[PDB]
Amino acid sequence: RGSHMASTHTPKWELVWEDNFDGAEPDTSVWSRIPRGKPDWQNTQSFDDRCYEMRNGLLILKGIVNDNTEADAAQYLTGGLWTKDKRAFHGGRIEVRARLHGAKGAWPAIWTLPYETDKYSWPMGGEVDIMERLNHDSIVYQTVHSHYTYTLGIENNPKHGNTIPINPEDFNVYGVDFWPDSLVFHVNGKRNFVYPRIETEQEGQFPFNIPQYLLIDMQLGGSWVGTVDPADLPVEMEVDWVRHYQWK
Template sequence: MSIILAAVPLLSTAAQGGSTREPCWRLAWEENFDCAQIDSTVWSKCTRGNPDWQNTQSSDPRLFEISDGTLKLRGIVNDDTTKDPAPYLTGGIWTKDKKSFNPGRFEIRARLHGAKGAWPAIWLLPFDHENNKWPMGGEIDIMERLNNNHGAYQTVHSHYTYDLGRTANPQSTGIYPINREEFNVYGVEIHPDKVVFFINGKPTLTYPKINDGADGQFPFYIPQYLLIDMQLGGQWVGEVDSKDLPVEMEIDWVRYYEPAQ
């Protein structure tokens, strides 16, 4: 895919509480899902694992479709538990071990179809995952939506928030309104001293670095890989209603910006 460069303004100074200078971002990479197949040089299908988000991930082709310029990731009832014991099957993609993103700005335009027990997510993990084990390397959740809620969660996780339980000062998570039936743009900016989330271009949560990142409070300023996945069920979202299935999330595009020189 060719690289398209463009300049876009940083979030407003008032939103960030910074100086009056407004630097720009440069569009360094984008994925528009305009080919018949997922670009295997960038993306892989998420593999099955033990965590709730991963315990129904599958490579079943019914879970993946590119059409009309969007990628559809689905959650379905498993119709053959003799081959796979999972009650449901879900699709996800990630750039793990393939494409690394330096700290910058990420935007993903997506539409989320609701169902009881649906848990779509867009998130970042350390590219060097072998030397940045969870939660020490941190996790940035650009978007998580439960069921058919009117809001999306945006969250950071780390040793500081998870192991030490320090989630309130500074605030590490929040739920923010979305246009439930429409496409929304979910975004995050990773700065040396803060992580700034936004939805549809409006700032939501800012998570600052404090005390020079002591106690593993701010591990986020490192290269990341991107995950986009549909999931069903789990301790957080609760039980699935199979009558609501299949369910899908649609991804229109992904854009990654780096600071303009």
């Protein structure tokens, strides 16, 4: 350009955006607290300050026993942030570094949904689970959901999810790479599994190459994780950073 060339280089992973959770609070131009909703994951989501902490340059999202008598009160309250309406991810590599804590009924998640919420439905628009950790497991699930996996029921051809062990007491790096023909899931730089775009008679098998928003949120209870043991509360997940790369 201006002073030096088509800067011709071997393409590589380039850091295009990061959040190191440096401030007194989540950057309000990127993050919002997740509101209450009906699905098992969104049951507990709360604006309560007791669900959120910045500590030691770490983001802290907590699951706690609720003390609301009100007849329409969640038994448990969880903290979550999302980039909905604030930051879109256009494929590339999304990585989150986080430390988890065992608790019966806890299933903290890191995941993405279509950014364009007035343009895509669930599950036809797709869902990418970068991390789900159940209970006290020393493994995490990485998973995709779509029209194809969920509405048509085709979960195993190709395999829509896989588990991989973690260091459960340590920080681990949860990652997904978006390509035109495939998603590739990583924990600490180890490949978990590939979700391929296949030739198929049906539709909705690979809706993922669309702008994404990122959700990071504590979750308590549901049919998948099983019952909560309040004795294991309060519980936290600690987030060191989010990094977004592009191959260029």
